[model samples]
Target: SNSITVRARGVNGQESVSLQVGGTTVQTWTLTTAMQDYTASTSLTGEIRVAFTNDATGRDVQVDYIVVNGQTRQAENQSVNTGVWANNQCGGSGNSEWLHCNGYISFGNVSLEHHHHHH
Candidate 1:
């Protein structure tokens, strides 16, 4: 993968976040209350990660979706939060799309699908 995209925003005012790939920080963004799509063009690694650090003053970050190697993974399939997880989604935390805590939201690996070629 040569690029990655994170569709997210700040819960309260503007929020600062670090976009990490394979446990490495690629770039930091000052996401606003309005949803924004942040794309980073870098070398591919293991997995995709969004670390929310500035969870202060009642501020939080919500990730709408993520695009890795053109594969769009919704926030509903993300993971690992430090604080509380609260969203409009009912049922369980596994059904929620909004990331309401300060932690690492990790998506799976970023490997290209190998569809076998036939003669």
Candidate 2:
């Protein structure tokens, strides 16, 4: 696909951030920081919607991310205190699990990783 509709909403919240891959924003239960979430196109082609609420609350918005054969993927337990992953879902080469980050912006990526730990 080349285009699509994306929507996001921050309900009963304030001074929060949201993530919208193809449009699907949810409110964070915090006031001192931001939160994010998103949806993607299952076809791998379209526009990508990203929403951010920094100082006030806002309603859901719409955007697009066409032709996506996968859902939003983020690395395991990512945080600012733990260190944000430098690569989005599009730059990693040896990752298998989904990865994402919510820092300067909301971003993510997908990879084809296999388990190699011995127990």
Candidate 3:
């Protein structure tokens, strides 16, 4: 597996967020009001972190779902947001998939490791 597809949209306004793998920033997604699929490729795995910084307009990001190695992890339900990441700058709904405030939200079960070659 070399990629993960995330389905999300911006709330209130366009949202700019970053994707982290094993504590390393890998990709940044700018989402609009419309829901869309954003994909990022990386060989790093283990932990998936989403970073949201404080915005001037109070914009937010609503992650409807996420796809890891073709497997779906629904944000609206359980099996998502294992815990708050470092600093915990962002706020959570405590019940929903919406990522609020500004900080890091982490998820797991993604295997972005390199695919083996065969003869």
Candidate 4:
């Protein structure tokens, strides 16, 4: 199954966030201060749209990051706050197909060393 892990803050009460794939809602969650997790029952791939709605006053809701099936789309400054209704794209522009953040995938043999910091 495919899933999206949403990290955000500033949610007080009576707010909701939704994820729609190809005009169909796969996951929707009520907002809270903790991390919100939503999983689609089946495999889904394509344009991912994130919607944020604030139904209460004095509480600002912001989306920090969204991870779809392991590919992460980080907010420009790790914050997309809203007092009214707002929406944003996760992967790319112009209704484009979603792509891996690194453009490829691998199994093992992973290294995290930066060449310039070798000692």
TM-score of each: 0.77, 0.24, 0.73, 0.52
Off by over 4 Å in 1: 79-92, 112-119
Q: Is candidate 1 or candidate 2 better by TM-score?
A: 1
Error of 2 at 49 (Å): 11
User: Model 2: per-residue lDDT, tens digit, 1-119?
Assistant: 32222222333334333433334443232322213333333333222323334432242221122122333323222221111233543223222211122222223322223496321
**lDDT of candidate 3 over 1-119, digit per residue (tens):** 45778787777656787877888888898888888898998888658766665454667777777777777867756444432222454343333566665654566636533466321
lDDT of each: 0.70, 0.28, 0.66, 0.45
Residue-by-residue lDDT tens digits, candidate 1, 1-119: 36788888887866787888778788999888998899897775767777787777678777778888677988766654433365533222653445455675776666544566321
Clashes of 2: 30
- Highest-lDDT candidate: 1
Q: Pick by TM-score: which candidate is best?
A: 1
Model 3 spans > 4 angstroms off:
78-95, 112-119
Model 2 accuracy (lDDT, Cα): 0.28
Can you tell me which runs of candidate 2 are displaced by over 4 Å?
Answer: 1-38, 42-51, 57-76, 80-108, 116-119
**Which of candidates 2 and 3 is the stronger one according to TM-score?**
3
